[PDB]
Amino acid sequence: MFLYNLTLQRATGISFAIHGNFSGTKQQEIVVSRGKILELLRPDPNTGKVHTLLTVEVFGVIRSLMAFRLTGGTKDYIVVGSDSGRIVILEYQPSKNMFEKIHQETFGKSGCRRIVPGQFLAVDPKGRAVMISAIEKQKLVYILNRDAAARLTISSPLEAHKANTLVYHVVGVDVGFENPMFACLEMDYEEADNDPTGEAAANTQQTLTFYELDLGLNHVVRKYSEPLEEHGNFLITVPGGSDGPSGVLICSENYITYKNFGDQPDIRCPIPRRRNDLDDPERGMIFVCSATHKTKSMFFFLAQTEQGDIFKITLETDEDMVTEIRLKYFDTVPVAAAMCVLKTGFLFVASEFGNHYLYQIAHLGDDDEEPEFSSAMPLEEGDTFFFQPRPLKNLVLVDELDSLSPILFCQIADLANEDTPQLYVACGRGPRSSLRVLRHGVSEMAVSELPGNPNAVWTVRRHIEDEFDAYIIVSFVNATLVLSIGETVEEVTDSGFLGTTPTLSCSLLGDDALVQVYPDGIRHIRADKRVNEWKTPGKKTIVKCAVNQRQVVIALTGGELVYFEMDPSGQLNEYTERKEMSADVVCMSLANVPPGEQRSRFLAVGLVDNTVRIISLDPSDCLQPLSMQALPAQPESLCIVEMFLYLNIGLQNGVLLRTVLDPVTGDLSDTRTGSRPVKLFRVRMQGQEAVLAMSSRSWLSYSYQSRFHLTPLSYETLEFASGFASEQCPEGIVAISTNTLRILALVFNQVAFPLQYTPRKFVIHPESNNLIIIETDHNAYTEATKAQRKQQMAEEMVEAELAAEMAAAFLNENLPESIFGAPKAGNGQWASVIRVMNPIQGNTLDLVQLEQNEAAFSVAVCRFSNTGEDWYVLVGVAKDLILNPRSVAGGFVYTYKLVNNGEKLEFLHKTPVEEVPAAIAPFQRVLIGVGKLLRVYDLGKKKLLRKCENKHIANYISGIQTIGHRVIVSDVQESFIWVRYKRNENQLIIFADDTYPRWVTTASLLDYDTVAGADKFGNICVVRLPPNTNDEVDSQKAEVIMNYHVGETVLSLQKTTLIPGGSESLVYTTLSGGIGILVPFTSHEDHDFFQHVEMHLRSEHPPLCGRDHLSFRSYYFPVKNVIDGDLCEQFNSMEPNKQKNVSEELDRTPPEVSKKLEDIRTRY
Amino acid sequence: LEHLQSKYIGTGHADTTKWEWLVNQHRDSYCSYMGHFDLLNYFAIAENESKARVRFNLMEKMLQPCGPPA
Amino acid sequence: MGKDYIYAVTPLLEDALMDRDLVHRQTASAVVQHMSLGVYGFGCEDSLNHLLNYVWPNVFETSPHVIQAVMGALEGLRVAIGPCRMLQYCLQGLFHPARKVRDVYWKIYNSIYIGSQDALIAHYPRIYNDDKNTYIRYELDYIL
Amino acid sequence: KHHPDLIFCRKQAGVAIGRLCEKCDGKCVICDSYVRPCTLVRICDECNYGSYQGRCVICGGPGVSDAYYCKECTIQEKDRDGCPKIVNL
Amino acid sequence: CFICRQSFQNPVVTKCRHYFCESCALQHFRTTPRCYVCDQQTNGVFNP
Ligand SMILES: [Zn+2]
Ligand SMILES: [Zn+2]
Ligand SMILES: [Zn+2]
């Protein structure tokens, strides 16, 4: 079907990151590639919080990311190596807040091929050349030169391809002002393939090959080739020149060796291990994340250990040879895949799981409590200085950017009481795991409500010099409340205006005296308990209140306007000239006069006789109506504001007429928005003035660039609308309802409750209505296993003194997962925990423990097939399971009674099997698939009653979906195989097969014959069976109805509506942290318009990676009836000339295309 | 034909061995798993290993694909 | 814009490919090549596979013009339909006992591998480990 | 409209720009078509440098217009195959 | 107001491509949901 897939939750897991002066100024810019979109951030180090400056989606897979600066350039250009064959060097433009491609040179074919260059990217340290090398047998280096206009003039690269020469890592060395050179970790592969005995594979080793780029000779030659004994898993470059020696450092398992260009001391420094670590010593510690930070004079490096602690090493170069490297553990940080040590007190570490950490490095790096191991310090080649886990002392963590990557399982439902449904995703790795519930409100992250039932909410500030509203008066007919703008809105009596009477408005018009319109009249009230009140015009109370800087017009019934001007003493003086309008003015506002004028230029009051009168507030033109605005119906409100100035009169019906507020009468244009009266007032939103008309829908006519446009907003149900400003956001839209205030950011708040181990699957019980989640951190030590290992270490090191106390301290208080990482090891061991989280709160109301070698995979909590209506849950756990390679013992299915109405995980019994029964679903009995054998076994309390099992599958059944008399199972080879579930006939016959090979890891049946699959290469394929297919037959294929590539490995998919109302689409959650909804387009004309807009945007706006959008969306298999919403979102973000060209090509308007995209987004 | 077409990665001939084709397929699978961020995250975060540790394991497994030739 | 007329010209090309003369087969192969390159990315792969079911028997021709048309049609079909169906067509004949048949199949597979080196890893067949070396990768079996 | 001979360079492309004479103007450099000239032609090396400056990337006349790839050859991205200048071997 | 043959003030066009006065378009949108020109689905929109 025609599906316009749009991603709602963006993936935030940064696979790689670089940093430097990429912003073109003194502010530090760090660009992190979070998948298909790269985000560049220039956050303030004084605040300490990390804020993304910009983000651009390139629609491709980046294999290597790097940045480089030219000679004397203040901007660091970013060279991106993507899956496409065009290497793109771009320069960020801060005026447009986006990256502009300086050059894009094609090298080879697209995709991540073996001989295609782009797997490794490096640049010269002098800004001379950039080298791109493949994973094997291909390398090139193009000389980068400055042009006459300081432009990056690229050159033709020189060929550096050698037969059977794999590359592990490469870096351009600092050669100073001489010809540049680059070192690579080459590894021969010809002798390993030629020799069949495998002796040459053991004889092979990594070699450091430094090739010098002879720029004068216009050739590339290998300068030095030094064979290394240790295999290079990483490589770093020491800062040459004035910051130290010019050389490289290769890291391995507890061995870091530094070598310079020529004869240097090979200081094979061992890694500083933790003080009595609970992890096993078989797993070697290597510098996984390396960050070399060069100061003005000296330089240093930061490395990641096996436990994840950031260790700072000084550069004791001493101008001769690599003598010492003081490897001391500077801080304890989380499990970070990459860490960057910026200047000006910034240190960004991108966590592979959980929240990335942006710390403020206030100290010089010597503020560490851990011990220091030096390369010049001798040892017995068995241990180093035991660096104990110190706290965040040298660098204090100032920002914790929460990332959902990696994602395990998710479920979205409206079980909680909120404006939007809650999507709870159980995710994480090891002990760093949580269930994050996300819900929206618009962005109602913080909920603030005015006290009582106020008639109005007006900010009566203490003074005009104070930026924040000191007393937001929520005023009713009976009383009033004072709530400050600090996201702590509650009732107080610190206003000082004494608002016991019914106050219509109270706004800080004066410098320190707020003008308040009330039934007493117009009162100038200061911050203290003083209020000078002048009477309204006539005996009637003031109903319309035009508020400005110096002159405030109070219009009572009959249209009689009294002008209160700002006196030189700070009080308000009533004008001696007054006149009546055509009818009684309902509401009013005054335009923003300039600072040269001593009064308002035009104050407009809207009467009930379908007219609005705008009069000058000066004393020379007092009581003289200048501008007449002809309202369509009888006006319920009026508002005069900027954009010169315009006055709009809104009626009780859906018609508001806006005219030009001036000394002459302007033309009135009538526009429509909710069967409610108008309460329009001046507010600020998105840098533009607006008048928010009170209706059922959030309608606010915003006058941006002298264009008044009114559109609905995606807020909750309300009867009035206004602006809002507090500590949560600088400018937002407040939709006021019956004792409620929806907040619109003119995102969804997610809260993560932690779990025990890494989650595998979440199951909601039918009786309990609570999530019985299973956490299984495999290939790691269990909590009981870590306790037994700590007790064994305490028993081993008890015999010595201080070693017994150190062993007892390490057993009692080991390295925590929140700070220094939980020390876990092993392969067959697995941390397993079954936790019951209630629908009210995500805390564990129950806890069930398994064996130390078992990982729970099957999560299904429902009623028992063998028993009655008792919710007996069968949970499958595979014991002694090793991922790489295949090494498992067997899978045990445990039946649990689920006591306390499912709130207690009371395990009844268990039954083992040789295969892995990770699939267990209800099927008339219950379908349990162990290995390739799926059996309709009744859910017994002690053991299951298997009746008939068929082992005709290819490898296994990772997921089975059923709707009645049929079960579709996803195998390793076939994406979906449908077998007729004849439980009454007790016969298993495969009704439908497939021809497209896909390792489907998800299932979401849109119909009985429709099966969805999420392949291992990140391809979403929805395949329907052929019509008129016999259910009791075989050898029949299912045609792929739709196929697309989402850019990430899709984990789960469910055919359910992820938003309240709208479109019942299908929501799929990926393993990289992305969630997308595939909305089926039921309109052929809208699908044709979207296809024409996509065909216009594919040529008008090329991708940043250089790959085609159709090539990126159809990388594995060809696309079929799939529309990507990323290009439709990026079409609205284009330039105005490009939007005009796209609208001329689409034969429509750019605002109409934006409205159609907004309607497609709001369809959900 | 072309010399670089026969010299390309994944190329073969009429007398190409099955072990050589399987080793080339395994080396291409290892290179595709190393190049792709999502495939490396799916094959890395499933176990309790780091991303660079998984990259080093894949670099060792690339040489291990030429481990037992015939 | 040809996707409205692919279903119209499908039986004409099917009748043209079954002709005795090599000129009809060569020019119909050019038709399949240009039609495959024209409406790529539009879900018309069923008729393209149906035309490939007549094109792929004609790969044994010896004249250079018709075999150049066959190679161009195979390249266009590998672009349009995808490399998975071309790999399915070539996997049962790459290890053919005949020298010339396996040579032609290896030429087609080498062209497909030059065009689709990256995408052939996910479309590689599921073969288990044998006595020479391990073949089933355990990284694909890992689930997070 | 092709010949079985005349392999071109099979060299890595560079910053030099292709150039077409009027006798074979408008043709695709690979498949010899006339539809949708999309991608510019890069001619790698000393095909441009020296006495062959601004010459034809086809037969050898004095070039007047920029050579282009068609959209059909760039559908499979054959434009990254290398230099398309004919060397008579 | 092309039916009553009267004067038009502040002219505007509705969703049914009919141009009339703003008060006349407001009265036509309040009285009926559809326009009186060709019974189009203007949905009572009183917009410029
Ligand atoms: Zn020519
Ligand atoms: Zn062409
Ligand atoms: Zn050339």
Curated annotation (Swiss-Prot), chain B:
**Positions of the site: Interaction with RNA?**
G10
What superkingdom heads the lineage? Answer: Eukaryota
Could you name the Gene Ontology cellular component terms for this entry? nucleoplasm; nucleus; precatalytic spliceosome; SAGA complex; spliceosomal complex; U12-type spliceosomal complex; U2 snRNP; U2-type precatalytic spliceosome
Here the disulfide bonds are none
Keyword Cell cycle tagged: no
Q: Name one GO biological process term.
A: regulation of DNA repair
**Is Nucleus tagged as a keyword?**
yes
Region (Interaction with SF3B1 and SF3B3) residue ranges read 5-66
Keyword terms of this UniProt record: Acetylation, mRNA processing, mRNA splicing, Nucleus, Phosphoprotein, RNA-binding, Spliceosome
Q: Where in the cell is it found?
A: Nucleus
Q: Which residues carry this modification: N6-acetyllysine?
A: K7
The terms under GO molecular function for this entry are:
RNA binding; splicing factor binding
Protein family membership = Belongs to the SF3B5 family.
Please give the function described in this protein's UniProt entry. Answer: Component of the 17S U2 SnRNP complex of the spliceosome, a large ribonucleoprotein complex that removes introns from transcribed pre-mRNAs. The 17S U2 SnRNP complex (1) directly participates in early spliceosome assembly and (2) mediates recognition of the intron branch site during pre-mRNA splicing by promoting the selection of the pre-mRNA branch-site adenosine, the nucleophile for the first step of splicing.
The name of this protein is Splicing factor 3B subunit 5
Source species, please? Homo sapiens
Curated annotation (Swiss-Prot), chain C:
Q: Could you tell me where this protein is found in the cell? A: Nucleus; Nucleus speckle
The positions annotated as site (Interaction with SF3B3) read E45
- What does the UniProt PTM comment say about this protein? Phosphorylated. Phosphorylation occurs concomitantly with the splicing catalytic steps. Citrullinated by PADI4.
- Origin: domain of life: Eukaryota
Q: List the disulfide bonds.
A: none
Q: Where is this region: Interaction with SF3B3 and SF3B5?
A: 88-144
Sequence intervals crossing the membrane:
none
Where are HEAT repeat segments found?
Answer: 3-41
The record's subunit annotation is: Component of the 17S U2 SnRNP complex, a ribonucleoprotein complex that contains small nuclear RNA (snRNA) U2 and a number of specific proteins. Part of the SF3B subcomplex of the 17S U2 SnRNP complex. SF3B associates with the splicing subcomplex SF3A and a 12S RNA unit to form the U2 small nuclear ribonucleoproteins complex (U2 snRNP). Within the SF3B complex, interacts directly (via HEAT domain) with SF3B3, SF3B5, SF3B6 and (via HEAT domain) with PHF5A. The SF3B subcomplex interacts with U2AF2. Identified in the spliceosome C complex.
Q: Which family does it belong to?
A: Belongs to the SF3B1 family.
What does this protein do, in the record's words?
Component of the 17S U2 SnRNP complex of the spliceosome, a large ribonucleoprotein complex that removes introns from transcribed pre-mRNAs. The 17S U2 SnRNP complex (1) directly participates in early spliceosome assembly and (2) mediates recognition of the intron branch site during pre-mRNA splicing by promoting the selection of the pre-mRNA branch-site adenosine, the nucleophile for the first step of splicing.
The protein, known as: Splicing factor 3B subunit 1
Q: Which organism is it from?
A: Homo sapiens (Human)
Q: Which residues of the full protein are shown?
A: 1161 to 1304 of 1304
Curated annotation (Swiss-Prot), chain D:
Q: Which domain of life is it from?
A: Eukaryota
Could you tell me what this protein does?
Answer: Component of the 17S U2 SnRNP complex of the spliceosome, a large ribonucleoprotein complex that removes introns from transcribed pre-mRNAs. The 17S U2 SnRNP complex (1) directly participates in early spliceosome assembly and (2) mediates recognition of the intron branch site during pre-mRNA splicing by promoting the selection of the pre-mRNA branch-site adenosine, the nucleophile for the first step of splicing.
Listed binding positions for Zn(2+) 3 are: C28, C31, C70, C73
Subcellular location(s) of the protein: Nucleus; Nucleus speckle
GO MF terms held by the record: DNA binding; RNA binding; zinc ion binding
Q: Name one GO biological process term.
A: U2-type prespliceosome assembly
- Renumbered to this chain, the signal peptide range is none
Protein residues bound to Zn(2+) 2: C21, C24, C56, C59
Q: At what residues does the UniProt record annotate the site feature described as Interaction with SF3B3? A: V15
This protein's name: PHD finger-like domain-containing protein 5A
Span within the full-length protein is 3 to 91 of 110
- Positions binding Zn(2+) 1 in this chain are C9, C44, C47, C83
Question: Its quaternary structure?
Answer: Component of the 17S U2 SnRNP complex, a ribonucleoprotein complex that contains small nuclear RNA (snRNA) U2 and a number of specific proteins. Part of the SF3B subcomplex of the 17S U2 SnRNP complex. SF3B associates with the splicing subcomplex SF3A and a 12S RNA unit to form the U2 small nuclear ribonucleoproteins complex (U2 snRNP). Within the SF3B complex interacts directly with SF3B1 and SF3B3. Component of the minor spliceosome, which splices U12-type introns. Within this complex, interacts with CRIPT. Interacts (via N-terminus) with U2AF1 and SRSF5; acts to bridge the two.
Q: N6-acetyllysine (modified residue): where?
A: K1
Cite the residue spans of the region called Interaction with SF3B1 and SF3B3: 33-49
Q: Name one GO cellular component term.
A: nuclear speck
Curated annotation (Swiss-Prot), chain E:
Q: Where are the zinc fingers (RING-type)?
A: 1-39
Q: Which residues form a coiled coil?
A: none
Known outcome of mutating C16A: Loss of E3 ubiquitin ligase activity
Q: Where in the cell is it found?
A: Nucleus; Nucleus speckle
| Tissue localization of expression | Ubiquitous.
- Please give the annotated consequence of changing I3A: Strongly reduced E3 ubiquitin ligase activity
Q: Which disease is this protein implicated in? A: Trichothiodystrophy 5, non-photosensitive: An X-linked form of trichothiodystrophy, a disease characterized by sulfur-deficient brittle hair and multisystem variable abnormalities. The spectrum of clinical features varies from mild disease with only hair involvement to severe disease with cutaneous, neurologic and profound developmental defects. Ichthyosis, intellectual and developmental disabilities, decreased fertility, abnormal characteristics at birth, ocular abnormalities, short stature, and infections are common manifestations.
Q: Which function does this protein serve?
A: Required for pre-mRNA splicing as component of the spliceosome. As a component of the minor spliceosome, involved in the splicing of U12-type introns in pre-mRNAs. E3 ubiquitin-protein ligase that catalyzes the transfer of ubiquitin onto target proteins. Catalyzes polyubiquitination of SNRNP200/BRR2 with non-canonical 'Lys-63'-linked polyubiquitin chains. Plays a role in DNA repair via its role in the synthesis of 'Lys-63'-linked polyubiquitin chains that recruit ALKBH3 and the ASCC complex to sites of DNA damage by alkylating agents.
What this protein is called in its record is E3 ubiquitin-protein ligase RNF113A
Tell me the gene name.
RNF113A
